[PDB]
Amino acid sequence: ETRELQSLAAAVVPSAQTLKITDFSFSDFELSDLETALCTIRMFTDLNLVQNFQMKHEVLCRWILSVKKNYRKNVAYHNWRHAFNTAQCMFAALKAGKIQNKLTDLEILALLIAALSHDLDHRGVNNSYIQRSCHSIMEHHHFDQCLMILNSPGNQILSGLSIEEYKTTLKIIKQAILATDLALYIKRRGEFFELIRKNQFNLEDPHQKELFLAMLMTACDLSAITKPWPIQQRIAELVATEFFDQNKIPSMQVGFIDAICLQLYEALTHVSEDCFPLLDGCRKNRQKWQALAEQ
């Protein structure tokens, strides 16, 4: 064992209220790497995943450290912090958004794992090493890294599942990670929006449920656009660093919000009214970006 593992396994995990992971406005700027690992343990714990699937504490701790280690720190935005924030928004949407009651335990377990793993080994939007070595090539690589870690010795947090549970969970994880491809979201959101605008959305149908899981993953993947203005400004700076280094930014932000985010969080609010803080935060950021664009 390394020094990081023994220090994390021996630490006391604060409650979800103390860690503020239940709030949609949560931010990680003030947290250290160890602190995000403890927040991740609390997410598994408070979703009853450690109990319902007999996860050993040292296995979950090693799995979290494996996931974090397989994100690249040199990447300005697509790193562990982005994955950690995607999972936190998933936790908040399940808890504060009351989506947890609409899903099964296996679905929740898969969503949390997928949210943390959905961008593993990302190299930046401008690096083509993965693609050089139908166009969901990056997301297939991310799931491949996720499956590799889940099968590594000491990291098998799904060992407590039966083959039927294990294969069902693996299938949901794969679909959830593949759903984080924006091309897939654009191709499929039309059916989701058409169902919602006719009061025809029903979660009991297996096809609509899998579509809801895909939209939920995108909503968490993009959730930085919903954060309080000081936080959203900071993350937008990280994104601009990845897009460029590795004056039209305000107008591009408004276009991104209009074309992608606004309708998604509106539809999510229709499924669960308690997810309104995400839609509200997205509207407030459109205000601040539009005012900067008019300047």
Ligand SMILES: COc1ccc(CNc2nc(N(CCO)CCO)nc3c2[nH]c(=O)n3C(C)C)cc1
């Ligand atoms: C070079 O500077 C820029 C900066 C931003 C833009 C357009 N805005 C975007 N903003 C975000 N996020 C909002 C925070 O700001 C982060 C996630 O929510 N993601 C984006 C874009 N575009 C994209 O494809 N993505 C994907 C990575 C989803 C264009 C040029």
Ligand SMILES: [Mg+2]
């Ligand atoms: Mg991704």
Ligand SMILES: [Zn+2]
């Ligand atoms: Zn992502």
